[PDB]
Amino acid sequence: AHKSEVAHRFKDLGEENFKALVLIAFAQYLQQCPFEDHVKLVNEVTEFAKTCVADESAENCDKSLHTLFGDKLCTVATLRETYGEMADCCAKQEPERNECFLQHKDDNPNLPRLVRPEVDVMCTAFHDNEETFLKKYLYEIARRHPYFYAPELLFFAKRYKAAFTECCQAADKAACLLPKLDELRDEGKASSAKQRLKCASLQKFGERAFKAWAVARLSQRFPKAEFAEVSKLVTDLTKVHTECCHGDLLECADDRADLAKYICENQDSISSKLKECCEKPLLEKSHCIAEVENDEMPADLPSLAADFVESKDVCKNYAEAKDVFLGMFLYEYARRHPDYSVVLLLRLAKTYETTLEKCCAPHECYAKVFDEFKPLVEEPQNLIKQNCELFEQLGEYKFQNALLVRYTKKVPQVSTPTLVEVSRNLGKVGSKCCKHPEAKRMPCAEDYLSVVLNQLCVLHEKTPVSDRVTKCCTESLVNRRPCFSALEVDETYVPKEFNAETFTFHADICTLSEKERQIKKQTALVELVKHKPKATKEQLKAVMDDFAETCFAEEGKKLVAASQAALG
Ligand SMILES: CCN(CC)C(=O)COCCOCCNC(=O)COCCOCCNC(=O)CC[C@H](NC(=O)CCCCCCCCCCCCCCCCCCC(=O)O)C(=O)O
Numbered sequence: 266a267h268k269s270e271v272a273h274r275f276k277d278l279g280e281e282n283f284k285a286l287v288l289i290a291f292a293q294y295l296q297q298c299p300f301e302d303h304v305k306l307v308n309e310v311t312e313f314a315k316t317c318v319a320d321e322s323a324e325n326c327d328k329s330l331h332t333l334f335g336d337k338l339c340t341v342a343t344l345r346e347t348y349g350e351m352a353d354c355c356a357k358q359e360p361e362r363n364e365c366f367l368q369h370k371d372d373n374p375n376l377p378r379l380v381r382p383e384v385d386v387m388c389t390a391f392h393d394n395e396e397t398f399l400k401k402y403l404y405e406i407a408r409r410h411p412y413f414y415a416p417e418l419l420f421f422a423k424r425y426k427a428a429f430t431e432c433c434q435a436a437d438k439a440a441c442l443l444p445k446l447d448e449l450r451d452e453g454k455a456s457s458a459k460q461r462l463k464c465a466s467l468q469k470f471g472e473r474a475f476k477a478w479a480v481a482r483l484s485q486r487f488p489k490a491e492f493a494e495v496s497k498l499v500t501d502l503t504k505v506h507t508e509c510c511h512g513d514l515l516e517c518a519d520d521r522a523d524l525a526k527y528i529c530e531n532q533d534s535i536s537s538k539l540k541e542c543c544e545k546p547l548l549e550k551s552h553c554i555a556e557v558e559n560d561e562m563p564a565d566l567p568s569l570a571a572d573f574v575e576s577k578d579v580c581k582n583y584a585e586a587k588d589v590f591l592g593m594f595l596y597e598y599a600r601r602h603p604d605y606s607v608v609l610l611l612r613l614a615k616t617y618e619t620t621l622e623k624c625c626a627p628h629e630c631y632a633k634v635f636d637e638f639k640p641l642v643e644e645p646q647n648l649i650k651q652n653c654e655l656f657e658q659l660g661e662y663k664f665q666n667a668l669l670v671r672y673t674k675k676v677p678q679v680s681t682p683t684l685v686e687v688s689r690n691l692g693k694v695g696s697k698c699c700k701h702p703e704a705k706r707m708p709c710a711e712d713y714l715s716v717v718l719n720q721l722c723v724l725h726e727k728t729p730v731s732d733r734v735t736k737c738c739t740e741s742l743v744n745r746r747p748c749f750s751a752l753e754v755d756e757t758y759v760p761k762e763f764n765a766e767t768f769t770f771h772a773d774i775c776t777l778s779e780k781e782r783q784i785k786k787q788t789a790l791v792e793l794v795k796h797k798p799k800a801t802k803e804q805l806k807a808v809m810d811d812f813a814e815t816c817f818a819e820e821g822k823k824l825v826a827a828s829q830a831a832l833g
């Protein structure tokens with residue numbers, strides 16, 4: 266309860282954050298209004314908010330934020346000519362008016378792709394007007410991503426500003442700024458990818474699948490927290506995620522702020538690692554918590570076998586609260602295993618459940634159910650072992666080439682840029698995740714593969730090319746990676762028709778960027794396999810000591826004509 270929600274927001278966020286969030290909020294609904302129009306709206310909303318700060322009883326200050334926002338959206342003179350049926354929302358009252366606006370947000374829209382200006386033009390633009398530069402970009406990205414959570418979009422903006430101060434004063438601006446902008450763009454695209462992923466999965470897999478995921482994830486985060494606490498948090502985390510997926514910023518904000526506040530008022534019963542997060546302002550609290558490192562395990566933890574295998578009442582305790590029992594199992598397994606992926610722990614829980622359903626329908630039929638856990642644990646642990654002792658012996662590029670031949674052969678119907686992008690991406694996964702010790706490797710792989718495979722399935726959901734790729738993308742979120750890891754070579758594929766122009770290279774290669782020369786060689790590699798999928802070869806680019814001049818044509822046309830018969 267609050268007399269002026271706008272005054273309260275302005276006070277808890279502060280002028281600068283307030284301004285940026287309103288810009289983002291207005292840009293996500295008014296996607297086609299120019300940067301200068303959104304500036305004048307922000308300035309008008311800001312002047313209004315300050316009158317409420319000076320006086321909560323000032324005219325219209327006691328109206329809800331949803332009310333004021335919809336009112337401001339309906340003052341837009343061009344609303345009907347530009348957004349069409351979005352202007353029909355203004356003929357409704359709250360709550361129907363806000364729900365109407367939410368549904369008219371264009372998930373696309375149709376805007377030219379945002380191109381990275383030259384490093385020196387970015388730094389000069391940033392010098393002469395840091396305000397206009399960053400906030401025009403904040404507006405440009407907000408308008409193209411209307412469903413991306415506004416505070417998180419502001420968090421990215423402050424890291425970009427920080428990338429621009431550290432590098433635009435550096436001797437070689439490009440060398441500093443370019444990896445940083447790549448990091449930020451890939452972090453933001455990962456953030457956007459996993460946002461739509463958990464929302465789609467909530468729709469398709471049901472609240473129970475979400476709550477299971479949450480039990481496992483929270484138990485790894487807070488291993489000293491009791492099951493009752495973890496359960497309370499799973500419940501609240503489930504409400505926040507369902508309401509956040511519906512996409513009402515304000516309702517999402519309040520739910521996230523509430524949960525963060527609860528966690529922070531109950532640190533002693535949750536984790537000893539929340540201290541800093543809990544001192545942070547309201548804007549950063551939830552984000553900070555979502556990102557905190559796993560707390561340390563209590564150490565005295567006995568085996569699960571006593572309550573989940575030996576206990577006379579395994580069936581009795583299970584039958585009287587099937588999901589709470591399975592949730593306690595997951596809690597107990599997950600708190601002891603921050604070394605596992607959440608997807609793996611979920612496999613152990615579904616396996617345990619399958620055993621209980623059969624063995625409780627005989628009782629002491631289970632007991633050796635903890636052996637039925639070893640093959641599922643060994644599987645992602647052995648595949649991490651294999652891929653990391655493949656990255657070691659080859660380096661990022663040579664390994665991308667090793668995975669490239671693989672995925673090209675398995676499912677050859679997928680396009681050449683997609684197969685290059687995915688192998689290049691999984692090459693980053695190996696680079697990132699294999700520099701972490703064995704016990705931090707599965708969450709790492711999981712987190713990166715969940716976005717690599719999400720982006721992949723998103724591509725295949727729009728232009729399908731394989732029935733097996735549809736299966737892995739439409740099977741359980743728990744079987745997505747093992748369904749993908751079980752892909753065999755297409756034994757019924759018809760080799761691609763040779764086209765000399767897609768196999769001939771010119772002088773441009775020596776001058777094209779390091780990244781661009783690689784993509785060019787990697788596309789030609791996807792095609793070298795698309796044409797010869799029966800061609801034998803272990804490690805392609807740089808093998809050995811393990812186990813597991815040039816010319817356009819003339820001298821250039823030699824390889825096209827020679828490898829034509831020197832490969833089958
Ligand atoms: C009465 C006239 N006014 C008022 C202007 C006066 O001041 C009196 O003036 C008379 C004397 O003249 C003085 C001199 N005059 C001047 O200078 C110019 O006068 C100016 C004359 O404008 C008159 C016309 N404008 C008006 O009335 C104001 C218009 C007003 N609407 C509005 O702006 C709409 C306000 C939008 C609500 C905010 C949502 C913004 C989003 C919140 C942020 C997102 C949340 C994130 C949380 C994350 C936390 C982490 C979450 C987690 O993740 O945990 C309205 O009507 O309601």
Ligand SMILES: CCCCCCCCCCCCCC(=O)O
Pocket residue numbers: 470473474475476477478480588589591592595611612614615618741742743
């Ligand atoms: C109280 C939380 C509910 C307990 C979760 C049940 C555990 C066994 C089922 C695991 C299934 C994985 C989730 C899914 O179906 O996608």
Ligand SMILES: CCCCCCCCCCCCCC(=O)O
Pocket residue numbers: 648652672676679683684687688691714721734746749750
């Ligand atoms: C499926 C569309 C073609 C794009 C490339 C195929 C990627 C196959 C999924 C790989 C599964 C995870 C990595 C692994 O095998 O450890």
Ligand SMILES: CCCCCCCCCCCCCC(=O)O
Pocket residue numbers: 663666768786787789790793796806824825826828829
């Ligand atoms: C059909 C015969 C055409 C011959 C040209 C094939 C293209 C070869 C792919 C490029 C391999 C580069 C690998 C690397 O540099 O590590």
